[PDB]
Ligand binder design. Sequence first.
Ligand code: ZN
Lengths: 277, 7
Amino acid sequence: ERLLDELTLEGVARYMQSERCRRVICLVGAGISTSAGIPDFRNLEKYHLPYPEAIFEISYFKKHPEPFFALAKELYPGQFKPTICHYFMRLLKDKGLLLRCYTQNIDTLERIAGLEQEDLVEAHGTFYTSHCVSASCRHEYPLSWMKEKIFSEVTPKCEDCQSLVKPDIVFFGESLPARFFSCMQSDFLKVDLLLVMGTSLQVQPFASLISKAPLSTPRLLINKEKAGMDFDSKKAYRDVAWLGECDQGCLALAELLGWKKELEDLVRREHASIDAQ
Amino acid sequence: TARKSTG
Ligand SMILES: [Zn+2]
């Protein structure tokens, strides 16, 4: 099927406004959180890492966790404040359009923006909660405990069994949560639109999600750069790229949908609430 | 299942 009239942001907006477009899946990455003061993870010289990527690999981390926690100290934001892009997804939720948000991010900003547990697949886990790595113990630790360890530069260690404590993030080389595969098996059978934001789709198996949708499902990319997507060839029929920052892409789309005022009000009242804490 | 990988 051909569902978009034209392969443009205006085309996608018209499609979203039509009765046909009922359920939208968002697929999001690091680019949706850069304007919230969280840099794209993709001083440390003193650790003499075998290569830079070892810092996020589970095998390296379990034996040498210090570089990761050193980086965590530098990356840790002074505040957790979701972006315009996060609040665009909140609008999708409130308008009954959000089937699911699959996130690569560990920053909890989707939760803070008001997406509920059931709205979310936190594909790479979360920094919010932490656990001892020992299967026979699994002692839980809260963010305040983890933050204290990070800022004091004391490696997190279990108070019961002395094992390493890690944030509940999926390190490279670890399995994704069962929820990722369970939701994937259902959500991509019947979805009207994929909204792919702030990701270059370089991390597997998350990147494979775009191919799981029906062949007729239109797909909009909002990202600083291009990404099995076809925007430009003579065979292009359903994929649209909008190139720039995620906040500005979501503002442009919101304006076309007639949501610009609603989105700006939402961002401002929610930011005010967070700043008042 | 497929582990988290850079590609
Ligand atoms: Zn323990």
